[PDB]
mmCIF file of C-alpha atoms in Angstrom:
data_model
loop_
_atom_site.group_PDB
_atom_site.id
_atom_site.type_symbol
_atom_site.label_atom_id
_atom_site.label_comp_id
_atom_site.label_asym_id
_atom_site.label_seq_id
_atom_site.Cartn_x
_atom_site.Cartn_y
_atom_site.Cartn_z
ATOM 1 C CA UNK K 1 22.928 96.937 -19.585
ATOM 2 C CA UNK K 2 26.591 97.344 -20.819
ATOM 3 C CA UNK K 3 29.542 96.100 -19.738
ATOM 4 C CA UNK K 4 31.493 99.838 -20.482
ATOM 5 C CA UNK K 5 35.117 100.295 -19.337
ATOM 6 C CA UNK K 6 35.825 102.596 -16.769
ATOM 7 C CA UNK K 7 39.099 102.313 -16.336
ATOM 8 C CA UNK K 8 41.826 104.950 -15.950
ATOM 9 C CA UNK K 9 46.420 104.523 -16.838
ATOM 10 C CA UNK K 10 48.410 107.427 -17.671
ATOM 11 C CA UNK K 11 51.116 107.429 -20.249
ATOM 12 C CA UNK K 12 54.567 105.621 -19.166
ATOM 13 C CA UNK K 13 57.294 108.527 -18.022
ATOM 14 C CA UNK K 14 60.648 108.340 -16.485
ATOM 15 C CA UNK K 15 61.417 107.398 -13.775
ATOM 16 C CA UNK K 16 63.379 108.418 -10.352
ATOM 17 C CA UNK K 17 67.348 107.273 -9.528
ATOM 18 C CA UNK K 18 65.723 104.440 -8.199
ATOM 19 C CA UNK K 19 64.238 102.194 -10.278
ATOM 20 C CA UNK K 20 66.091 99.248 -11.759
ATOM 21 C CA UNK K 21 62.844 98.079 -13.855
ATOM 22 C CA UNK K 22 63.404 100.640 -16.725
ATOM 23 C CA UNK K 23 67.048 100.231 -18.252
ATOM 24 C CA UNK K 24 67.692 100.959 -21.786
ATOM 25 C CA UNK K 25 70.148 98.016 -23.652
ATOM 26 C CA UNK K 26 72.748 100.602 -23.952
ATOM 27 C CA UNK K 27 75.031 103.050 -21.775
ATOM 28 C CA UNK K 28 74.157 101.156 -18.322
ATOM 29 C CA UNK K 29 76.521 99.255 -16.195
ATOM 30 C CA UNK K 30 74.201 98.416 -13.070
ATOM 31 C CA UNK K 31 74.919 94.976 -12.026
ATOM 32 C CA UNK K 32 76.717 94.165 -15.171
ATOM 33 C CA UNK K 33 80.886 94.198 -15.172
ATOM 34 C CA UNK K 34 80.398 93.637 -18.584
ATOM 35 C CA UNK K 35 83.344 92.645 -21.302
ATOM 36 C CA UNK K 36 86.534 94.833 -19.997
ATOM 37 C CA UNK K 37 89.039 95.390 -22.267
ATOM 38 C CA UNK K 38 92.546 96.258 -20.290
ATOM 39 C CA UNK K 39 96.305 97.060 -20.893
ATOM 40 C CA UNK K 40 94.940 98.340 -24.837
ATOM 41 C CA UNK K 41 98.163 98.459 -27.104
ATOM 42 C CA UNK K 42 96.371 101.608 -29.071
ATOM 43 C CA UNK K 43 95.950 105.144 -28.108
ATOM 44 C CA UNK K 44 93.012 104.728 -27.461
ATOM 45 C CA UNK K 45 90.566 104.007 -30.090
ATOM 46 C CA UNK K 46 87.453 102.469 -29.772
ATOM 47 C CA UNK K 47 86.876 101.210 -33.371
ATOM 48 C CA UNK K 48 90.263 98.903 -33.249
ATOM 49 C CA UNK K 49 88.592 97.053 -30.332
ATOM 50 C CA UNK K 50 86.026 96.348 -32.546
ATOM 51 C CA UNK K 51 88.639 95.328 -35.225
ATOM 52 C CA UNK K 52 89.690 92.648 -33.220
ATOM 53 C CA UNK K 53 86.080 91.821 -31.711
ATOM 54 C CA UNK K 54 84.784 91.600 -35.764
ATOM 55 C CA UNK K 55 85.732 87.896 -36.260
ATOM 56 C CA UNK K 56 83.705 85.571 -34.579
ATOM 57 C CA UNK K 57 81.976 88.119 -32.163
ATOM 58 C CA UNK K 58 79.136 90.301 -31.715
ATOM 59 C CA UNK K 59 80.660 93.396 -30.318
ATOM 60 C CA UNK K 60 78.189 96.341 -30.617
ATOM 61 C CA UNK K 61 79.458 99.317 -28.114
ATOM 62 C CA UNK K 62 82.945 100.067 -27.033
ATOM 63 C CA UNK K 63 84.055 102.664 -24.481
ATOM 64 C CA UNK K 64 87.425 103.962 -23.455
ATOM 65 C CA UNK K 65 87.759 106.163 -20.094
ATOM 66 C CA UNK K 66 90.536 107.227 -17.321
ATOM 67 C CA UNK K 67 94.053 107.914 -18.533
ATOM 68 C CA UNK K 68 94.875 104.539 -17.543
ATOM 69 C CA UNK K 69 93.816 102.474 -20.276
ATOM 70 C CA UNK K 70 90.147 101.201 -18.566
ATOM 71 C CA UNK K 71 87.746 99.968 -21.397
ATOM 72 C CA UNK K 72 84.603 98.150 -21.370
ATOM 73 C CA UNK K 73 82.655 96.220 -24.354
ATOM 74 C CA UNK K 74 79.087 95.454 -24.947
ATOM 75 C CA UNK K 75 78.143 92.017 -26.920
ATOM 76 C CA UNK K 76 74.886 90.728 -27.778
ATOM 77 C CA UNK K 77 75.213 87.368 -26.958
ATOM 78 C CA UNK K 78 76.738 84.921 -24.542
ATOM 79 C CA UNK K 79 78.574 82.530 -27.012
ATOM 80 C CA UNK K 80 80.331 85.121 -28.846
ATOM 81 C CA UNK K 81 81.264 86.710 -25.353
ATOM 82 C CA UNK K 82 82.954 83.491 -24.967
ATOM 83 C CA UNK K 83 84.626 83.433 -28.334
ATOM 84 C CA UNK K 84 86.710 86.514 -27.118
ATOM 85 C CA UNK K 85 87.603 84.980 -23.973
ATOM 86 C CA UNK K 86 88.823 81.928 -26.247
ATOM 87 C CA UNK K 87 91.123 83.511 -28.130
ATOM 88 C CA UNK K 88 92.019 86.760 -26.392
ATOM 89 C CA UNK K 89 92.947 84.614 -23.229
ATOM 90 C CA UNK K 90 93.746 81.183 -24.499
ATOM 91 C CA UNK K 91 95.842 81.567 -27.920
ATOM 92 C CA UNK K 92 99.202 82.560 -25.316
ATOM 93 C CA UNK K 93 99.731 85.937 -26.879
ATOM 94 C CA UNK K 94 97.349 87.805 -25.455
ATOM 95 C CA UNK K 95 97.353 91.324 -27.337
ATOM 96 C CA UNK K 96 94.722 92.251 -24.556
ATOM 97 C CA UNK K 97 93.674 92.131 -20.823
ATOM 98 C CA UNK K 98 90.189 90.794 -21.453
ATOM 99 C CA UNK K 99 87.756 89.593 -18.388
ATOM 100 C CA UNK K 100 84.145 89.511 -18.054
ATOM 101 C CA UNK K 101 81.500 89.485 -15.464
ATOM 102 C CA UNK K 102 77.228 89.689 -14.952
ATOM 103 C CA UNK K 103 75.328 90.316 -11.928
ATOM 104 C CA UNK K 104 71.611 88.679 -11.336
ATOM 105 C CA UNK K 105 70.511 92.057 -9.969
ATOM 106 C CA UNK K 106 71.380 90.951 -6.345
ATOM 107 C CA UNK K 107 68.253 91.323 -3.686
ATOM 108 C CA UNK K 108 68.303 91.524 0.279
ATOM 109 C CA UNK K 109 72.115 91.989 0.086
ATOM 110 C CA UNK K 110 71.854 92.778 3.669
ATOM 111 C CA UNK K 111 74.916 90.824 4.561
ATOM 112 C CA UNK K 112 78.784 91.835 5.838
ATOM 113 C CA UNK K 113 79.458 90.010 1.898
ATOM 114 C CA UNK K 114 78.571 93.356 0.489
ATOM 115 C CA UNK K 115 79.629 95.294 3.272
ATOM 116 C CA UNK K 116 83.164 95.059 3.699
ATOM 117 C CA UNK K 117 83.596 94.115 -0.072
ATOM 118 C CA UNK K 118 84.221 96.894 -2.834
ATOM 119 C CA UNK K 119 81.827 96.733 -5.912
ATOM 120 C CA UNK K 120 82.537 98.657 -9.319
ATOM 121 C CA UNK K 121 78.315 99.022 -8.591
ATOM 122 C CA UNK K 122 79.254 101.893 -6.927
ATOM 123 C CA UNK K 123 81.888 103.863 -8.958
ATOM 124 C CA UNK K 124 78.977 104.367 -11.329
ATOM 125 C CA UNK K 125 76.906 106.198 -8.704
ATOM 126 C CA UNK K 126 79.755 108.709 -7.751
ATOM 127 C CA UNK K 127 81.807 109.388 -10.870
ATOM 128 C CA UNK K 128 79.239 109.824 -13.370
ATOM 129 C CA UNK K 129 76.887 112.150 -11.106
ATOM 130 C CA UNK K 130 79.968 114.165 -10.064
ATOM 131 C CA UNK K 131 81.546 114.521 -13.467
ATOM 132 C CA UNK K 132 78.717 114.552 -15.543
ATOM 133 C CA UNK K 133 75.952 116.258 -13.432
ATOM 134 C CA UNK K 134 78.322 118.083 -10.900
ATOM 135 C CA UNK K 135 79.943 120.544 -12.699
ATOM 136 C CA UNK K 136 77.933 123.665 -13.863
ATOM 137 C CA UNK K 137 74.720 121.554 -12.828
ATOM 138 C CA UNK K 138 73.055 120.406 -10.213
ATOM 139 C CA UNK K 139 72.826 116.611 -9.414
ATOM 140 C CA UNK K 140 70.117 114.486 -9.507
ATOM 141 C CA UNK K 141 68.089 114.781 -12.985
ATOM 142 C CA UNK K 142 70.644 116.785 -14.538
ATOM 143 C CA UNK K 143 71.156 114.595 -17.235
ATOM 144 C CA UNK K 144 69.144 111.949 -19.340
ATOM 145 C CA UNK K 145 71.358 109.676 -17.298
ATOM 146 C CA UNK K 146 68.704 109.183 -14.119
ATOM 147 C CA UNK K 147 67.063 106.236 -16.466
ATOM 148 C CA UNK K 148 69.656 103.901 -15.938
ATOM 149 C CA UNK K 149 72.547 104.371 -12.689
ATOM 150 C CA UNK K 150 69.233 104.121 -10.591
ATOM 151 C CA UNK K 151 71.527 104.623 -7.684
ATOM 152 C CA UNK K 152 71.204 108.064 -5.471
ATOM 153 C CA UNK K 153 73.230 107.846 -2.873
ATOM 154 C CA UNK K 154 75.242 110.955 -0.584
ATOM 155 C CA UNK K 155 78.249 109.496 -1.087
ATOM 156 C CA UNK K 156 80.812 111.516 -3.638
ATOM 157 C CA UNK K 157 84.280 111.072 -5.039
ATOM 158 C CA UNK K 158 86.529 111.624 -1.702
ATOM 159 C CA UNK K 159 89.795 110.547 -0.689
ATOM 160 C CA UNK K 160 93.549 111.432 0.444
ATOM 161 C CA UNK K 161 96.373 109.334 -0.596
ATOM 162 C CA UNK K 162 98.062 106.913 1.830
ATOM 163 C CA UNK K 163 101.705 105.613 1.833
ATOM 164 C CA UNK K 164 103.135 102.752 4.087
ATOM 165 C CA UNK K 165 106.606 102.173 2.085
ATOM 166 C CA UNK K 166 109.683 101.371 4.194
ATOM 167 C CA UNK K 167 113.169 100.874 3.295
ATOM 168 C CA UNK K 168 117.060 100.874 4.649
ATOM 169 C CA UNK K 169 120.155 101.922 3.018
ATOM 170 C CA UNK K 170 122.961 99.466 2.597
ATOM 171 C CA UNK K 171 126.610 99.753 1.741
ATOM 172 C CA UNK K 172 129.052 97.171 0.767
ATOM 173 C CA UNK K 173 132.294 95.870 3.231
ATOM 174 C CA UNK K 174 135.956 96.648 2.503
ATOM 175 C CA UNK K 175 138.803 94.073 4.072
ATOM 176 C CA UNK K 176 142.113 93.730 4.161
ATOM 177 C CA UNK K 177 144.991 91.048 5.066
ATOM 178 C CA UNK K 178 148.179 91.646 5.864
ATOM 179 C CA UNK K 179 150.573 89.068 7.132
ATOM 180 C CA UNK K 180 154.103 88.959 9.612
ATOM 181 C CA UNK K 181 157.152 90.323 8.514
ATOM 182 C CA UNK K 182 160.457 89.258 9.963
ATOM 183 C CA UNK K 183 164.008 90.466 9.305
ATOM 184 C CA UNK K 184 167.392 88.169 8.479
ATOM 185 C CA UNK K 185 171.119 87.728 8.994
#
């Protein structure tokens, strides 16, 4: 006798919006905040971010979006995600806004913690499928980008604007004094 496989795999293909288990290193931002880079002093231009995030960093993608000055970095490591933390929040002259944030890809979030709490997990799902696969497309596998956002939900970019502002005029007071008056011989 022989001991002959019989076995039978197909090739790896993509995947569904649904699938957190296949995400390239670059152009996600599931469960990561990542480095974000705020209040930028430049018009915009993503290769002076990494001309202050050369020295002692390893800075390898930048990104600038909205016309309100929103960036976000990617770094390579931990420590030198730190070192621009150090100086571009610590030295007292900060030249930019910069925070930073990871997620441990969250599980059985069933909980009012992450139900009446806003997550930037969820401005990815809406603003890149609306603007980038909404537009003279349909959505859902429009765009290469259904290997990553792995989120697919209904929900779109929707809102009115809302104003609760209240004021009162004021004016200031006007007084006078005038005193007796009396005749003589």
């Amino acid at each position: 006798p022989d001991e002959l496989n019989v076995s039978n795999n197909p090739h790896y293909r993509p995947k569904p919006v649904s699938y957190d288990s296949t995400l390239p290193p670059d152009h996600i931002k599931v469960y990561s905040r990542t480095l974000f880079i705020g209040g930028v002093p430049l018009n915009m231009k993503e290769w002076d971010l990494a001309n202050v995030l050369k020295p002692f960093a390893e800075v390898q993608s930048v990104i600038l979006n909205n016309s309100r000055k929103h960036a976000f970095v990617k770094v390579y490591s931990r420590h030198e995600a730190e070192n621009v933390l150090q100086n571009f929040n610590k030295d007292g002259a900060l030249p930019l806004r910069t925070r930073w944030g990871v997620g441990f890809g969250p599980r059985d979030c069933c909980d009012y913690q992450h139900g009446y709490s806003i997550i930037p997990m969820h401005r990815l799902t809406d603003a890149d499928k609306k603007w980038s696969v909404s537009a003279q497309w349909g959505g859902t596998s429009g765009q290469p980008l259904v290997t990553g956002i792995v989120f697919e939900e209904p929900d779109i970019i929707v809102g009115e604007g809302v104003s609760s502002k209240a004021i009162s005029q004021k004016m200031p007071t006007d007084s006078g004094r005038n005193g007796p008056r009396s005749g003589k011989p």
